[PDB]
Design a binder for this molecule. Structure first.
Ligand SMILES: Cc1cccc(C)c1OCC(=O)N[C@@H](Cc1ccccc1)[C@@H](O)C[C@H](CC(C)C)NC(=O)c1ccc(N)cc1
Length: 329
């Protein structure tokens, strides 16, 4: 066995976070563990924007293993931008440490008011090297190269609000987390943890849709066209301007998403994508789904999918393994 287990903390089934440390003195930070990006960044002690106010800040002068870099970086997410410079220091994830190149952030104006209203300190990417700024080798690939872990893979057992905690597990697959078979789907590219699946909901079908398995997206994203076709007559209301689709929690017309390959069929019933339950007035629910268009039809299988399905991210075999997550630990 062995394996490096990092506990995940849930925030109302919307978000979940995990802790890691930087510096030979292991200064603590709370992170978004993101399979959809490939850089680690923590706010520096030299950051004075309002966002930086409530955060755990990184002080390089307090760490002997720190190595100066200074190369300026502007980190642009779809969610916002943070800027700073590269630095090298010891990074500690679970019970493992390694020297690592990260971004020391000094300006978060372009990420406010989001950052100001966040509990996390930084973001820790878990994608492929080519998805990174600075050509940074993935943390997991490094640990493997350094013989600290059994395999160059990590798995996500997402926490379920109310029922249980989760775990980011580095180095090997633990059966304690799933039931039934674990089916692998080959990555179509070494960038995002993206695989090809046929997407189906009700009548609509999108053959060989690119699907990004993203721990960092808190919703299921659907191409707008496909989304337009499925909402016809469903008793699902869109609040204009805003990305909210609301519906009665008991709307019997709600469809099950179906993602299929010749290896497995993964579904997402209404109970997995309806947020709310006993809300404003009667039983209004919002769908944790939004429309989003990429150059080629893409689905982002974000947290709602991962909460149902245990996922394995395998660098050695360039694939994503999917299994039904055990309901409770
Ligand atoms: C939270 C949330 C809710 C609904 C929908 C979405 C999309 C979402 O997520 C918002 C978000 O920005 N998510 C990212 C992680 C994140 C989460 C919260 C706050 C900031 C970032 C990350 O998971 C996903 C994106 C790419 C996909 C949209 C294709 N990454 C980059 O932008 C990126 C940047 C630089 C790179 N070199 C590589 C990638």
């Amino acid at each position: 066995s062995s394996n490096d287990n990092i506990e995940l903390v849930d925030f109302q089934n919307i978000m979940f976070y995990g802790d890691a440390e930087v510096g030979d003195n292991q200064q603590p930070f709370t992170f978004i563990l993101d399979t959809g990006s490939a850089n680690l960044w923590v706010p520096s002690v030299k950051c004075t924007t309002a966002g930086c106010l409530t955060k755990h800040l990184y002080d390089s002068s307090k760490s002997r293993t720190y190595e100066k870099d200074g190369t300026k970086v502007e980190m642009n997410y779809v969610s916002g931008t943070v800027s700073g410079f590269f630095s090298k220091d010891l990074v500690t994830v679970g019970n493992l440490s390694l020297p690592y190149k990260f971004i020391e952030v000094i300006d978060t104006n372009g990420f406010e008011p989001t950052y100001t209203a966040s509990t996390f300190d930084g973001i820790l990417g878990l994608g492929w090297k080519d998805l990174s700024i600075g050509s940074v080798d993935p943390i997991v690939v490094e640990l493997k190269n350094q013989n600290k872990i059994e395999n160059a893979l990590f798995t996500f057992y997402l926490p379920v609000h109310d029922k249980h905690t989760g775990f980011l597990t580095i180095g090997g697959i633990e059966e304690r987390f799933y039931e039934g078979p674990l089916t692998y789907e080959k990555l179509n590219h070494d960038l995002y943890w993206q695989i090809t699946l046929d997407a189906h909901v009700g009548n609509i079908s999108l053959e060989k849709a690119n699907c990004i398995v993203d721990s960092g997206t808190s919703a299921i994203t659907v191409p707008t066209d496909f989304l337009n076709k499925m909402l016809q007559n469903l008793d699902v209301i869109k609040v204009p301007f805003l990305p909210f689709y609301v519906t009665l929690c008991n709307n019997s017309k709600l469809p099950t998403f179906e993602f299929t390959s010749e290896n497995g069929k993964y579904t997402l019933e209404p109970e997995y994508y309806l947020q709310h339950i006993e809300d404003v007035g009667p039983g209004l629910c919002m769908l944790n789904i939004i429309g989003l268009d990429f150059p080629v039809p893409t689905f982002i299988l974000g947290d709602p999918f991962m909460r149902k399905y245990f996922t394995v991210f395998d660098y050695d075999n360039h694939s994503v393994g999917i299994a039904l997550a055990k309901k409770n630990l």
